[PDB]
Amino acid sequence: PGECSVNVIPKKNLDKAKFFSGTWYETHYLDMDPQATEKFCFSFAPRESGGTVKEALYHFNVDSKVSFYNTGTGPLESNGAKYTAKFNTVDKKGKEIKPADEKYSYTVTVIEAAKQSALIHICLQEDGKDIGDLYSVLNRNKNALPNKKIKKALNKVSLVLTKFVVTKDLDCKYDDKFLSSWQK
Numbered sequence: 001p002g003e004c005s006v007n008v009i010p011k012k013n014l015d016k017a018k019f020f021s022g023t024w025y026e027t028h029y030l031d032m033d034p035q036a037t038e039k040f041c042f043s044f045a046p047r048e049s050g051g052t053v054k055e056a057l058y059h060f061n062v063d064s065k066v067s068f069y070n071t072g073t074g075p076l077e078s079n080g081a082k083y084t085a086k087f088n089t090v091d092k093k094g095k096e097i098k099p100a101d102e103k104y105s106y107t108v109t110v111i112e113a114a115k116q117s118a119l120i121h122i123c124l125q126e127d128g129k130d131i132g133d134l135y136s137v138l139n140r141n142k143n144a145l146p147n148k149k150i151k152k153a154l155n156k157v158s159l160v161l162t163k164f165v166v167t168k169d170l171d172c173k174y175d176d177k178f179l180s181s182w183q184k
């Protein structure tokens with residue numbers, strides 16, 4: 001069973017306006033499938049209004065040199081640092097090229113945020129059942145190292161940063177304009 005991790009604790013009192021703004025780059029990631037060894041880069045632009053999150057997602061497969069673009073939309077939980085979204089597929093210009101498949105969703109939890117850093121966890125689900133999960137360290141700057149608060153959050157749940165894949169040395173290609181222009 002590709003079971004999602006337990007003990008994923010949403011940050012208490014996340015500053016919403018701060019987190020749900022601008023562009024976040026993944027700097028480190030830990031796919032919980034040890035055989036998922038394809039190198040990836042990721043960036044996203046999450047926005048929130050009225051209790052609904054609308055975000056633009058960008059992945060880049062370093063192995064295959066193929067990128068894919070998604071948008072996700074879903075309700076923010078009352079705790080303010082977790083949301084479950086449905087997603088579609090779009091092209092670089094924002095047009096839908098594949099509609100949302102109802103049977104798929106994902107759940108994002110913001111575990112910690114400090115200064116220019118954040119730590120999130122994503123659980124992918126098919127029909128409300130776990131199909132896989134990933135932790136990611138985020139930063140406003142592609143090359144930056146995480147704040148110590150991020151490490152403390154990882155240690156609370158027996159993870160260490162060395163187990164994460166480090167992005168900065170890979171041949172990432174980003175579409176920063178797709179994200180910068182999100183909702184403009």
Ligand code: HEM
Nearest residue numbers: 026029040041042044057059070072087106108122134136
């Ligand atoms: C907010 C954070 C993230 C969200 C919401 C997210 C969302 C998604 C979604 C919806 C898919 C499925 C796309 C599809 O099958 O059509 C996907 C696939 C995938 N994502 Fe993420 N992702 C996030 C972060 C990351 C990060 C940080 C990495 C690694 C650096 C990553 C690696 C992957 C991989 C390896 C796949 C499988 C792609 C394939 O089938 O070729 N994701 N992600």
